[PDB]
């Protein structure tokens, strides 16, 4: 029995537009419009990086990348 | 599908409880072979014309017997005056004979203890009823 | 006994008849459009 | 009937009248006798002969039929071999 | 495919005009459902030996299911187009 009901789990992203499956053509998305419209393909935005260090919007590295991380598990 | 439709006829169209249907299947396996429509007619014959309620229909293996025998004996008694269909209130002038006394007993015992008539008259009535059924169909 | 069916509360007022809720559905958008066409000074509540 | 149609504004014709009555251009309306095809086995020869006849209509009936039909049905028709060509006009009629 | 037909005939529209439909023209009756038609066969030209059908370059009438599910998807057969027929004809006459 898994904990966390599907309806509460994060919704799956909508399926990609079929236009993206055609090798030779560049899809026409609403990225240029800088806003969503329902009759254009949904852009695939590249991952974004803030570019600097903002303390109030900090995203710590994964636990495995911390300097003090150790395979041996201490018990505190 | 045959088994399921038999069970569905017994439950939805005959309003037998689940336990009642299981007991009916246990006691009268021939119901499964019996075709639909005929089974419903037999049950409604017991229910309306004979005024037998589901607990009695199940307790006495009424569905075991054949519709021909059931109609023969029951209509013979009804025309003789021994049997009487219950009224709207479910009451009868004279208590009706028991289903075991009608169907389970042999022909001679049924004619002597309950009908109190002659085998010759019973044969004549059986032929007449068969002719009437043929004409009706 | 009757008459005071209105028990004012700005939270309920805005959440029930506000601009955001009217735009939240196509029917509310058409409500706002009807008010604009009629020339209502107050489009929403 | 429809005095002004919704598409042309014209007066319409009750086609039930056209399917049943003949108009002679003189203004008379001819018809069959009701029941002339019904249960002939129980009707006497004289009654059958009466029923098999083509019959004129009343003045009021003719007026009603004229109202119910438009002018197109009240024109001169020079059909090739019309059996009613002679009957289309009146002769030796005083008032 | 479901093929339907109007219960009520649509009045002629004209040459350049479009027919004007009404509520009664939306009433349909099913004349035929193509899926219930008897199955036909697909003509294919085999490219590789396949059990119980043929060897290579021979026209074969195969059940549409087999043609569209195994032969064509796996390349064991090609459509019996005029071009393919010609090419396999040259193959045969060269062999």
């Amino acid at each position: 029995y898994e904990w966390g009901v599907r309806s509460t789990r994060k919704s799956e992203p909508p399926p990609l537009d079929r236009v993206y499956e055609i090798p030779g053509l560049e899809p026409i998305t609403f990225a240029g419009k800088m806003h969503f419209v329902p009759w254009l393909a949904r852009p695939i935005f590249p991952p974004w990086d803030r570019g600097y260090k903002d303390p109030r919007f900090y995203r710590s590295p994964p636990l495995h990348e911390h300097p003090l991380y150790k395979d041996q598990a201490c018990y505190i | 599908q045959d088994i399921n439709d038999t069970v569905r006829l017994l439950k939805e169209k005959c309003l037998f409880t689940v336990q009642q249907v299981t007991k009916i299947l246990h006691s009268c396996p021939s119901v499964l072979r019996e075709d639909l429509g005929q089974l419903e007619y037999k049950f409604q014959y017991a229910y309306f014309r004979m005024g037998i309620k589901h607990p009695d229909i199940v307790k006495s293996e009424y569905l075991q017997y054949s519709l021909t025998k059931i109609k023969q004996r029951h209509i013979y008694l009804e025309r003789l005056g021994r049997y009487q269909t219950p009224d709207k209130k479910g009451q009868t002038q004279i208590p009706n004979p028991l289903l075991k006394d009608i169907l389970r007993v042999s022909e001679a015992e049924f004619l002597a203890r309950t009908a109190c008539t002659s085998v010759e008259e019973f044969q004549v009535f059986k032929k007449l009823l068969a002719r009437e059924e043929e004409e009706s169909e | 006994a009757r008459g005071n069916e209105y028990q004012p509360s700005n939270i309920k007022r805005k959440n029930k008849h506000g601009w955001v809720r009217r735009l939240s559905t196509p029917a509310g958008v058409q409500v706002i459009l009807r008010r604009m066409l009629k020339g209502r000074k107050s489009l929403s509540h | 009937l429809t005095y002004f149609s919704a598409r042309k504004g014209k007066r319409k014709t009750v086609k039930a009248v056209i399917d049943r009555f003949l108009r002679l251009h003189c203004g008379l309306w001819v018809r069959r006798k009701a029941g002339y095809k019904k249960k002939l086995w129980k009707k006497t020869p004289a009654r059958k002969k009466r029923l098999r006849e083509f019959v004129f209509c009343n003045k009021t009936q003719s007026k009603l039929l004229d109202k119910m039909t438009t002018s197109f049905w009240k024109r001169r028709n020079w059909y090739v071999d019309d059996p009613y060509q002679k009957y289309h006009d009146r002769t030796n009629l005083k008032v | 495919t479901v093929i339907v037909e109007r219960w009520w005939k649509v009045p002629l529209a004209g040459e350049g005009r479009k027919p004007r439909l009404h509520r009664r023209h939306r009433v349909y009756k099913l004349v035929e459902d193509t899926k219930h038609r008897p199955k036909e066969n697909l003509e294919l030209i085999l490219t590789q030996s396949v059990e119980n059908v043929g060897v290579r370059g021979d026209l074969v009438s195969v059940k549409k299911s087999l043609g569209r599910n195994r032969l064509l998807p796996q390349g064991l057969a090609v459509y019996a187009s005029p071009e393919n027929k010609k090419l396999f004809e040259e193959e045969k006459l060269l062999r």
Binding site: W3, V5, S7 | - | - | - | -
Partner: protein, 234 residues
């Protein structure tokens, strides 16, 4: 409606979880089940129904210590906090489960039948025929779903091949692979039947709303040959 299920927690824990009542309403806000609403506020204790759940980086049969047996507001049966290795979990306590007792959870189907001690979990194949069981799975590793109410106990009626026939408390036969695990003995709180609600207020505390005041009166439709005898006048 803006209804989101409170069953959103993803990681198992021992803490009672604040649970939101439904009132018999769907996520759409409409009543779907009647007679539900109100009652005492409750906190949910996540029960681990997969009693053979060997700890991380561990395997094989393991023992556990019954830390305590507690009343569960969300169940008829009472629960038991039980600890093994370096973890604690809630389970459904059996009739004679006591604090400080030892519990065994094994996946070993021994050639001989294992001595059935109440409270431990063995695969159904390892139990002697006729032993009382509960917290039975439908499939291997699915998790206990049957025989979970207070005082209920199924019977391991038969074992043939890899299939065991169990008698559910409703006296219905059920076929389950003998590798599926079940716990021995009858569920706790056996006297739940005899509890007397005493007053309508106690039901309202339990969260059951009163039945509808409407008076509810199907019927066998007579066949044409029988329509003449339906309502014979007196």
């Amino acid at each position: 409606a803006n209804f989101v299920s409170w069953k959103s927690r993803t990681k198992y824990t021992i803490t009672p979880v604040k649970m939101r009542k439904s009132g018999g309403r769907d996520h759409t806000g409409r009543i779907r089940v009647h007679g539900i609403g109100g009652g005492h506020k409750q906190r949910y204790r996540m029960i681990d129904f997969l009693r053979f759940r060997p700890e991380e980086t561990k395997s094989g049969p393991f023992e556990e210590k019954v830390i305590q047996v507690r009343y569960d507001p969300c169940r008829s049966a009472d629960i038991a906090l039980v600890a093994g290795g370096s973890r604690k979990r809630w389970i459904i306590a059996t009739e004679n489960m006591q604090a400080g007792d030892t519990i065994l959870n094994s996946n070993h189907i021994g050639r001989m039948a294992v001595a059935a001690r109440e409270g431990d979990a063995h695969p159904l194949g390892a139990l002697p025929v006729g032993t009382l069981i509960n917290n039975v799975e439908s499939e291997p590793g699915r998790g206990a779903q049957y025989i979970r109410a207070a005082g209920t106990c199924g019977v391991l009626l038969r074992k043939v091949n890899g299939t065991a026939i169990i008698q559910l408390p409703s006296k219905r036969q059920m076929q389950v692979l003998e590798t599926c695990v079940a716990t021995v003995g009858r569920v706790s709180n056996v006297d739940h039947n005899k509890r007397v609600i005493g007053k309508a207020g106690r039901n309202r505390w339990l969260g059951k709303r009163p039945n509808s005041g409407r008076w509810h009166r199907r019927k066998i439709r007579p066949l044409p040959p029988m329509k003449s005898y339906v309502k014979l006048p007196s």
